[model samples]
Each structure stands twice: as C-alpha cells, then as structure tokens.
Target: RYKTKLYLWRNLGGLIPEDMAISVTESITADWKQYNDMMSKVRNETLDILKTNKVATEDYIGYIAFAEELAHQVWKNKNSSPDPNTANEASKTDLESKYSDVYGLDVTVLDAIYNAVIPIIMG
Candidate 1:
C-alpha cells in the first residue's frame, strides 16, 4: 500500500518545485501509524473511479485515468472558477480542505502518510 501511494504522491513527473512539494508535506503531521486506513481510502477511492476491480496496480493508475475524475469533482466544487490565476491561492486552500473532507480525518494515518510527504512540507 505504501509503495503504491508513494508512487502517486511522488509522481512529480517533472512538475517538481519547492513550494508545491512543501504543501504536500505539511498535511501529513497528524498521525502516521494509522495511515493505512486513510491510504486505503484514498487508493480505493481512486481505484473505484478506475473501475478495474483490482487492488492497486501501482504504476498505471493514471493510465486507467481516475485522477481526472478526482480533479473534475474537486475543481468544480472547491474551485468554483475556471481561471487558475483568479483562484490560485483559494484553490490551494480549497483543495486542502476538500481533500481532508473527502478523506475524513488526517489524524487517522498521520504517521505513515506524513513521512511520505514530510520532506516537502518541512521546508
């Protein structure tokens, strides 16, 4: 599970930057030991959208293309605007909130998940 989640989370794919990586990290400080449930939830949610009836393929989720579904659902509701520049900061805040909501709680798996992104968040 960690391996699969790590792949997607670390999938900068050349999009890497100081700030972007930081944002991904700050949220992981809750509780890492119990991260399994939250990771499972996120992975499962992504998988359900993939419709592959499988337990995380690890390197081809984007190929299955469920991230777009996540993007679509999150974009319209939290963003509420088409222009990225207009909603830039707001979208970041909105995404964090929406992501927390969708996942329910960060404390559940803070330990395991936080380490995965801590390097980015710690600045």
Candidate 2:
C-alpha cells in the first residue's frame, strides 16, 4: 500500500521545479527512512480524513484522482506565483470547480484532502 503511494508521489516530480524534483526523487530512491516518514504522515492524514468523512476505503480511486488533480493544481500555482511560497487564488477556484466531479466528493472533502497532501508536495 505504501509502495504504490510512493510510486504515485515519485511520478509527480516532473510537474514541480527540477531542483525540488531532484530533492524529492532522491529522497525516495536513496533515503528510504526519510521517504517513509514523509509518506507515513501523508497516508495517516489521508486515512483520517476518509474515515472522518465516512468515505469508504474501497473508493480509493476517487482519492487517487483527487490527489492527481491536486498535484496539477500545485504545478499551476508554482508557474503562476511570483515566488514559490505564494498561493494562487485562481488555482483554488479551479480545483473546487473540477474536483467534486473528478472525485465524486464534496468540496469540504476536497479541502480536507488538499490540506493533508500539500505539506509534502510543497516542502
């Protein structure tokens, strides 16, 4: 379970800055302890959100699609921001508009999921 989640995150390196991507990818490939620690937190947070919302674990594909879209939103934000730390307002609007249909979930759920995933992606 954790391995596949790591694979998904590893695949996202291309969408971020090359330097950041290299750091993230190297951690995944060369530092198992570090990578596992990051992923373990993300996984635990995600599971908590799902459980809190009464979302079935069997509906994982919905969560996967939501995660993918969130990554794209991060890429979009990175490109549009004046600095890496700046937030893009439009990306949040775009995410809310498309996320529900993609995930078959409510906007509140998206907010929770987004919060859970952003820390590692933005680090």
Candidate 3:
C-alpha cells in the first residue's frame, strides 16, 4: 500500500539527489509487494527499536525511505573506480552522518533499523 511520491524527495530536505531519488522511488515502486511485505515485517519486529507505542506513520515511511535511498546511493557510487574498501568507508561514513539527521531519532536507533532493513529489502 505504501508508495514513494515525488514530493517526498522534495520535502525530505534534498537529502538525496533528484535523479537518484527518483531511481530509488522507481525501485521501491517496481518492487511494491516486496517492499510492503518488508515494511509490515519490520513494523512488527522493530516497533520498540524505534520507540513507538504502535507502528506510527513516521515509523513506516522513514524506514522504507531510508532503505530505498541507501540502495540508490549505492547504485550511484557503484560504477566509480574507487576500490571496495574506499567505497565502503565512504558509504558507512555517509550512512552514519546522513541517517542520524534524517528524522531526528538517535543515531543508534537509526543505525539499528538500517542494519535490520537493508538486508531484508535491499538484498
């Protein structure tokens, strides 16, 4: 039932590049069923991880949006000539910094969700 809209990119503070953001949007849309299934699974599993009484609106939207954004970021940098180690360092750094500020949750909490969701959805 969840879908990415163009305004999300515009309104999420330009955290992702316009072109790559749409790519992320399309990727999630293309895999809508899988995306929603993962959303439901993570919603139940990590309710407390996100510190919510129930699966609130932001919980679902923020998690999926971050997952998709990470995928698109990876795709954008994949073709660069940097070695794997270099790229990973940069990626991890970016994830740590970008995610903390994405929605104002504790960085540790965001990190936990990133670890949980990236595997299920991005893989």
Candidate 4:
C-alpha cells in the first residue's frame, strides 16, 4: 500500500529534502487510505478540468506526465531550501521556466495541476 509510494519518494533521495521527505513519508504511511483518497479526489478534479476543455487524449496524457515532472522539479529545486522565502522564489523561477514558451498546451492547465498538488508537498 503506502510502502510503494513511500519507496518511490525515498528513491528520490537527494532530489527531495531529507527532513521534508521523511515527514511526508511518515504522514502518508500512517494513513495510506486517507491519503490515497485525497490524492484520487485531487487527480479527478484536475482531469475533469481537462475533460471540460476537450483536451485530446494525447495531450491529456502529456499533461499528466509533465505535471509529475513539474512536481519533482519543484521539490528538488524549491523544497530543498531551508528558507521559506527562498523556496518560494525558487519555485516561481522554476515554474516560469517550465510554463513559459509553451506552444501546444494551455498554461492555465499547468497552473491548475500545480495548485492541486502543491499543498501536499508544501505541508
């Protein structure tokens, strides 16, 4: 159950802040079912946005992949910092670089996904 998710994050090791990662792992593993339900709800709401936009299947898949990558990038670059303001600035830069100059997809879609997942990571 949660072991698998915990292992996935643990494998990211250096990419994730060690203290934050440990806490996240503990939080999720302590209540795997609840965490899973919350994540599922979040994911479904994001997907519903895509569905409403009539995004193509390929684009939908691409969005999901990019969102996952974006999450990791944010955690690696921003969450590793000790200072809150520094972490916030880092994420702003990281996101601008990520979302700017996109030709195929809507930036709002990316933003929606970010808003959905960030609380979990930031907590």
Candidate 5:
C-alpha cells in the first residue's frame, strides 16, 4: 500500500493529487479479490512469455506498466482476435517492446507486491 502511494505520486504526480491517489490506491488494494481475479484472467500467459524471453524471472513480474500492457494485450485478444494462439504471439511482441523499462517499475511494483501480497500468500 505504501509502495502504491509512492508509485501514484511518481507516475501521476502533477496530474493528480496525493490524497486522491492514496484513496484510489487503497480502494483498488482493499478490493484485492476482485482486482486480483481480473488480473489473473489477463496475466499468466504474458508472464510465462516474459520469463521465456528472459525478460524477468519466474518469480518476478516485469512491472506495473508491464502488467498494464499484459492486461491490455489479453483483453484485446480475448475480445478481438479470432486466433487466441496468435494473440499470444502479439502479446509477446508488445511485452518485448515494452521490456526496455523494467528496472524503472521493478523498484516500485515488485517491492510493493512483496510488501502487500506475497508475504500473505507465497510466504
């Protein structure tokens, strides 16, 4: 949650207020079940491809932005693509294209997930 605070501030600093960001961060995190469910629907294959591409470790998700792209790719495929298998290829392409900025978001997203979720689950 604290990491969420930092992330919103840095990525959305001038566009939004800290107080509003804090509330939305809390809102999204508090409804963890729904948020996670929606994410799970969109994440696994993209994550697998990332690891296969050597973009990240099995234990590491690329970043929040990576997750955003993953969701976008999956949501796009699931809705629009007639070829789900080919959709995977497209997802990988997008993931690779965006992989350039991994470290930037890792500092925020991975640590945040560790602090907020993994301790309760993987640990």
Candidate 6:
C-alpha cells in the first residue's frame, strides 16, 4: 500500500524560499518502484536547482561527530526493535543531526532533504 498525503513544509518567515523544482502533482505511492521513481526526479531536480542558484552550502554544523556516532548505533540495532511509527515523517535537521540524541535521525537523507535551507552566498 502507498500513500499520497505528502508532509508539508514552509520557510519560517513565509517568504519565497525556492523555486518549484519538480512537479508536486506526481502520484505518490509507497510502492518501491513508484517511490524510487518519484524520489529520483525530486532529488535530482532539487540538487540541480541548488547548484544553479548556488544556494547550497558546506558549512560545518559543529556537532557532526556526536550525531554520526549515535546514528551508527541506531543503524546497528535497527532490526532488534523495528518500528514503523518512528518512520512516519522526519525533517531535514532531524535527519542530518539524527544521532544527536537531540535529533536522532533514523531516516534516509532524501526523506529529510525536504527541509533544505540555503542562504545567499554573498550575504
């Protein structure tokens, strides 16, 4: 069974954040093939848009190690106690800093990619 209800998000100030990189009107099914197809288009388009706009960044978050270490442990023990509830939805910050114990990310990067935020490079 697949789902069509997309988790929504908006920038803090209700300002124009980014362009509509991909068509949100696509069918959203949880079926592996459907999910993968949709994801590829969405992910690739997002990357291209970021690159073109030069809105992406490599700034270090300062808490990488703490988050990563925890993520490692989470992945290791994933099977012993699998739970779908936790996988319902997650944000970008939640994904990257998942291991932070504060932001433990047990989801894939793409799942969290929706929350991507970029600043004007020269600003």
Best by TM-score: 2
lDDT of 4 at 19: 100
Give me the overall lDDT of model 3.
0.58
lDDT rank order = 2, 4, 3, 5, 1, 6
TM-score of each: 0.23, 0.53, 0.40, 0.51, 0.35, 0.25
Instruction: Assess each prediction's global lDDT (C-alpha) against the native.
Output: 0.42, 0.68, 0.58, 0.64, 0.52, 0.36
Which window of ten consecutive residues has the lowest lDDT sum in model 3? 80-89
For model 3, residues 52-86, the per-residue Cα lDDT tens digits are 53445665666556555654455455546365435
lDDT agreement of model 6 with the native = 0.36
**Model 1 reaches what TM-score against the true structure?**
0.23
Please tell me which model should have the higher TM-score, number 2 or number 5.
Answer: 2
Question: Which candidate gets the maximum lDDT versus the true structure?
Answer: 2
Q: Candidate 3 regions off by >4 Å?
A: 1-56, 116-123
Name the lDDT value of residue 36 in candidate 6. Answer: 58
Tens digits of per-residue lDDT for model 1, 1-123: 668767776646565798978877766754553445444555554444334333334534332233333333333534465654444344345544554565443322322322223222222
- On the 0 to 100 scale, the lDDT of residue 62 in model 5 is 50
Clashing pairs in 2: none
Alpha-carbon error at 57 in model 6, in Å? 11
Q: By lDDT, is 4 or 5 better?
A: 4
Candidate 6 on 1-123: residue-level lDDT in tens? 234333333323454434442333233333556535544544454465445544325512322332333333343334343652243223233444544345442334333333221111001
User: Of 4 and 6, which scores higher on TM-score?
Assistant: 4
Candidate 1 structure lDDT: 0.42
